[PDB]
């Protein structure tokens, strides 16, 4: 709707030790490695949907949650898998990445006019990229706004810098209603 | 090629005087003004290509330019186009606000690799967006990358945040290359 609804959460925890990846593929029911396609094993829960990383480093990503609080809960059940596969992994550093929304204003956007009116603040070449990029500092966020009162918000690391993001652009999007 | 060729400059300029936009529409062999279609008058020039937007504030943004040296010299044009047609305008505050460009490095980028390397500075999600946006610091510029191996940087004011921007990814993107 018109708040920014999240949806995809990217977050990042350190296993605390080095992971035999071919083996963890191996021994998991939900989980590949085939290092020509992607350098990270690859495991996945079913509800709710995610997606693990598992990196040699000990490093794994976890992305695919809707939530901060479903990624960390993500983050621990794979943790407890990785675990329960007899690794000697540990739950250290989780933090949140990146956060990407969307909402909808329901009108059309004459991207020109809001282009060529805050030409320091974004960037519009059809020939080149659908939507207009928006850069936004304060938060820092970028925008991406499309002609159809779509909006995509990425950058953030924390869920209200979206919704501050989103009420500071609002005002600016009103003015080009096509 | 594989160093960024700038696609696009735009530039602003104040006029210092407010000007009558239907009038510079009517006497102006090039220029239009539909004010339901587009607050401002548009005139536009032959070579090189460019485009003039003109508003009742006396600003004027000058897009379409391929350089600096470009952009400045279709502004003067600009000017001395609207002081011909009777308008008691000025040069003031050239600006250059924002540069575009691209480039190609000839191989294919598993994206999905790079995102979550660099999660914390970019953005994919195909489902939203075509490509990968990525939110350089240092020098301030965002790039979107493509599998395809295009690169557009975009949000520069001057021509070496470009290059500098272009050779703080290429190592990164040559980690992820991709059949």
Not at 6 to 13: D, E, K, S
Not at 132 to 146: D, E, G, H, N, T
Request: aromatic residues 10%; hydrophobic residues 45%; glycine residues 4%.
């Amino acid at each position: 709707g018109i708040i920014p609804t999240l949806q995809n959460v990217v977050a990042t925890v350190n296993l605390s030790c080095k992971l035999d990846l071919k083996n963890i593929a191996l021994r998991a029911r939900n989980a590949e490695y085939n290092p020509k396609r992607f350098a990270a094993v690859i495991m996945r829960i079913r509800e709710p949907k995610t997606t693990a990383l598992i990196f040699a480093s000990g490093k794994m990503v976890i992305t695919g949650a809707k939530s901060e609080k479903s990624s960390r809960m993500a983050a621990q059940r794979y943790a407890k898998i990785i675990h329960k596969l007899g690794f000697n992994a540990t739950f250290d550093d989780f933090k949140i990445q990146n956060i990407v929304s969307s909402c909808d204003i329901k009108f059309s956007i004459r991207l020109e006019g809001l282009a060529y009116a805050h030409s320091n603040y974004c960037s519009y070449e059809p020939e080149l990229f659908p939507g207009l990029i928006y850069r936004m500092v304060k938060p820092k966020i970028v925008l991406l706004i499309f002609v159809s009162g779509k909006i995509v918000l990425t950058g953030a690391k924390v869920r209200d810098d979206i919704y501050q993001a989103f009420n500071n652009i609002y005002p600016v999007l009103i003015q080009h209603r096509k």
